[PDB]
Design a protein around this ligand. Sequence first.
Ligand code: HEM
Ligand SMILES: *[C@@H]1O[C@H](CO)[C@@H](O)[C@H](O)[C@H]1NC(C)=O
Ligand SMILES: *[C@@H]1O[C@H](CO)[C@@H](O)[C@H](O)[C@H]1NC(C)=O
Ligand SMILES: *[C@@H]1O[C@H](CO)[C@@H](O)[C@H](O)[C@H]1NC(C)=O
Ligand SMILES: *[C@@H]1O[C@H](CO)[C@@H](O)[C@H](O)[C@H]1NC(C)=O
Ligand SMILES: [Ca+2]
Length: 595
Amino acid sequence: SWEVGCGAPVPLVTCDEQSPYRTITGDCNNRRSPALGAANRALARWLPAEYEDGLAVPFGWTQRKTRNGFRVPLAREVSNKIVGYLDEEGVLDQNRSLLFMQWGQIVDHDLDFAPETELGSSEHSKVQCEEYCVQGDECFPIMFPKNDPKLKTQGKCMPFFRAGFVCPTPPYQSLARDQINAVTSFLDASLVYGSEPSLASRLRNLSSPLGLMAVNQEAWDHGLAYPPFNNVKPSPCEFINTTAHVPCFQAGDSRASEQILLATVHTLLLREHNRLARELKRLNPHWDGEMLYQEARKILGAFIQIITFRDYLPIVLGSEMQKWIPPYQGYNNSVDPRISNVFTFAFRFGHMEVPSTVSRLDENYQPWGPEAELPLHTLFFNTWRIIKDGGIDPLVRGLLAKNSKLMNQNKMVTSELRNKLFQPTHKVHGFDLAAINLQRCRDHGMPGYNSWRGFCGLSQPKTLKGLQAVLKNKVLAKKLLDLYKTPDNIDIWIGGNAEPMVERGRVGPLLACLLGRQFQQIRDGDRFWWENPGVFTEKQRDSLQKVSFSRLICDNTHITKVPLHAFQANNYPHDFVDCSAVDKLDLSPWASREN
Ligand code: HEM
Ligand SMILES: *[C@@H]1O[C@H](CO)[C@@H](O)[C@H](O)[C@H]1NC(C)=O
Ligand SMILES: *[C@@H]1O[C@H](CO)[C@@H](O)[C@H](O)[C@H]1NC(C)=O
Ligand SMILES: *[C@@H]1O[C@H](CO)[C@@H](O)[C@H](O)[C@H]1NC(C)=O
Ligand SMILES: *[C@@H]1O[C@H](CO)[C@@H](O)[C@H](O)[C@H]1NC(C)=O
Ligand SMILES: [Ca+2]
């Protein structure tokens, strides 16, 4: 033990018996072990952590040390040589709408957040890290390799602060550092409601006994709601356009405004909660504020689970869907529902599905205005383009008619993210998400590519020849071994994303395993899974089955034409139908009378 204060939240709870509703923090879901899956606990470790000193020091930290006898390559060099490309022509996913990417980021934020330590760090530390690229304490800077273009405009590095972690306590026993998951591991709409109780309360409209969530009082979108503003100064969302000075949104998850289409989906989900609460208050005039809130919350939660498991995962996992996630057989309280540390890297496959632009489309799905198509980089922490420039309807139409990027082994991450990322505590559109992901793997003590291959029962290549065969690409394998020297040292994020995709899915074998396992567990280990007998009545369940993303849009925007299968690539007008053609959520089963 030395004595640097760590990241530190506030854990466990005492358990209501027949509460038919989730706690906010996720506690008491598992009765035998009530903190399992709760927020602000350690990410689970499926494998032992791998640090330079076995405890906390990341691989890459110390210069004359090695990982299995080789130096680990600079995160930014990997990014440049393997992950980058110039030509966007032909990169789109011909069979996935942009909503596919976007629903992923949504589900990811419901499940995991490992907070970082920059905001809470001293000004000195921040300056040493950004200004001077000085490694030490929480600063683990991402150094530019020789010849990096950014040497000519941004100095020697990008600053990077280590993830928060669970505090060494008595007994004091030497144990490897564990990063925190600040949200609930359950797929439970925590990104709307919050994972912490004072936040959840602040988000609620407690001024009326109508169980509503609070909405913005300064702006509306053709009469429809926006989230409240987060009214701190300073705000990154204000920083990117001080003349507009439109703050970030306040939602159940703090990342909600990181980009405009994420904020768009958060907005839809919030609108849907209030829609539900109003429809239930009509059906059950006697229900009080709490009951309306909880019951709406419970339905929104189920909506997320259904869209995720029925529509989304089958198109991520393809032929592996059934293998990892066989038909449900009910709650198993021996299942660990916690999100693993590795899954928080595995689920960043999403970063390769994000295209270089976002479009606003009018009601004929044609470009909306003279600035119809926007570069992605201008949309990070951007709420003013929503509030001052058309609201969400034109963005929602783009979600449906435009495509996700397709992961490609020589076009991995768009430069909008690999060179122009804006980070909320800094001032430049010049960060590299890919480098940051790699650096972060090391921060979190990730075992390497082959450790995970073996965990998943997959071959572990050792030579160029073996790696070529796994990746079905000789050049990519060559470039990886020139950088990493042994496949054992390949960082999980890039190794997993390098593998060719499984049939009918959008990830390879390794990722299919890590993701498939996790999703199996968050379903099987959740007492309030929507299909678990007793959570919903059977009539409630038969209604829920009809939910769709298209109907969510129909109900919470003024978009009047939608496809049936919103995750598929769909072209207007041939694939689009009027909203009367889309099933509704029939709420009569929630009719609670006295007799
Ligand atoms: C424009 C789109 C996106 C942006 C700008 C974005 C940005 C970021 C940023 C800045 C981080 C934090 C990186 C770090 O410090 O380690 C991150 C993490 C993450 N991203 Fe994304 N990302 C996007 C899309 C997606 C998508 C589509 C997925 C999944 C399908 C996703 C999944 C994640 C996950 C799992 C994490 C780790 C979260 C945690 O547990 O802390 N991202 N992304
Ligand atoms: C696109 O994928 C979906 C799976 O949702 C499939 O039903 C559809 O027919 C596919 N079409 C093509 C050309 O890949
Ligand atoms: C709370 O609800 C009332 C209607 O009961 C509405 O007039 C008011 O604006 C709401 N407040 C917020 C913050 O949403
Ligand atoms: C900033 O926003 C203002 C006011 O909303 C808008 O008129 C202007 O074009 C924006 N400028 C930039 C540089 O984004
Ligand atoms: C619950 O989980 C464990 C571990 O996966 C397993 O051995 C056991 O079969 C499961 N229980 C039931 C009733 O399926
Ligand atoms: Ca959650």
